């Protein structure tokens, strides 16, 4: 459940974005929205907690964003330590979270 | 306030009528609860005081 | 006793109601809360109750 | 700082269940939910329940209605995770995770805050 673009890529220096799509009920009702990093072969990161909120520690590189039933991360300077996997996991069902697929990120 | 989200459900009951009631409480459980300033209150005592 | 949990509040009671046809009763329940419900009476402290 | 700590490796055949505990560290153990998380190899994170130390109230995911309960020992502070009726699809690691914080007066039971994120541990069923 819930939809997210499978990779994304570019240079150095960069900036890009990933997005995360649900129903109205999942993202649309709530700003309960949040982004985990994931190097391969680790317990993922905690990044974003609150649709555009950083906790301690996490760099001003990242940041994110809500419109209607979809959100996304923004992910600015990029360099090869941001080559991880990222998921979103927002506010699902009744009383409930669910997770996305996750995204690959390539910095070329 | 009263922050759980309880459900409803309805039971049919005779010729057409029908009688609510709740069925579920989905989410987690709360205490009702009513807020007030206690500054604003500390002024509306001491003046409610002097009056 | 929702999911594994205990709320103070409220009881799950559980009562024959009747349908719409007068032959036919049918066991329903519903999540009254304390206050509304009271034991009954000429029972020995059992987990009867009415409102 | 704060750790969660969590069983050693499983493996089992199918139809045995498994009950994975967790151990957090750091922290008031019945200050904080926890929030139970899935990840097959190579797929993506699952969300699977959350539990509510401090009463033991406990949500889960519809497609775990029955087939997964958790329950808890204050006393010792830990938490348990029985998984039921095993697949050979449920070889996944498994993460125990640090919710919202509890408190009478607002649910921040579903809210996705997972502060802090245990080991993981692999169940293996084949």
């Known amino acids: 459940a819930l939809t997210q673009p499978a990779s994304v890529s570019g240079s150095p220096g960069q900036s890009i974005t990933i997005s995360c799509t649900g129903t109205k009920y999942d993202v649309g009702s709530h700003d309960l929205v949040s982004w985990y990093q994931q190097y391969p072969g680790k317990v993922p990161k905690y990044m974003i907690y609150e649709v555009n909120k950083r906790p301690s520690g996490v760099s001003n590189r990242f940041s994110g964003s809500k419109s209607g039933n979809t959100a996304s991360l923004t992910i600015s300077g990029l360099r090869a330590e941001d080559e991880a996997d990222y998921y979103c996991c927002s506010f699902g069902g009744s009383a409930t979270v669910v997770c996305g697929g996750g995204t690959k990120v390539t910095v070329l | 306030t009263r922050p759980n989200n309880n459900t409803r459900k309805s039971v049919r009951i005779g010729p057409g009528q029908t009688f609510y009631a709740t069925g579920d409480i989905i989410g987690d459980i709360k205490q009702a609860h009513c807020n007030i300033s206690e500054e604003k209150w500390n002024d509306t005592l001491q003046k409610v005081g002097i009056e | 006793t929702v999911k594994t949990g205990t709320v103070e509040e409220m009881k799950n009671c559980s009562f024959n109601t009747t349908t719409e046809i007068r032959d036919k009763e049918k066991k329903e329940y519903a999540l009254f809360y304390k206050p509304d419900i009271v034991p009954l009476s000429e029972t020995n402290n059992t987990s009867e109750y009415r409102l | 700082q704060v750790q969660l700590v969590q069983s050693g490796a499983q493996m089992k055949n199918p139809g045995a269940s498994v009950k994975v505990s967790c151990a957090p560290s750091?922290?008031?153990?019945?200050?904080?939910?926890i929030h139970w998380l899935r990840q097959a190899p190579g797929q993506g994170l699952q969300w699977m329940g959350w539990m509510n130390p401090q009463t033991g109230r406990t949500n889960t995911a519809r497609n775990f209605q029955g087939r997964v309960t958790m329950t808890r020992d204050t006393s010792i502070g830990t938490a348990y995770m029985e998984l039921r009726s095993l697949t050979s699809d449920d070889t996944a690691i498994y993460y125990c995770?640090?919710?919202?914080?509890?408190?009478?007066?607002?649910?921040?039971?579903?809210?996705?805050?997972?502060?802090?994120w245990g080991q993981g541990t692999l169940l293996t069923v084949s």
């Open positions: 995770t640090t919710g919202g914080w509890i408190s009478l007066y607002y649910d921040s039971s579903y809210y996705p805050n997972f502060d802090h």
């Open positions: 750091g922290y008031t153990f019945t200050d904080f939910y």
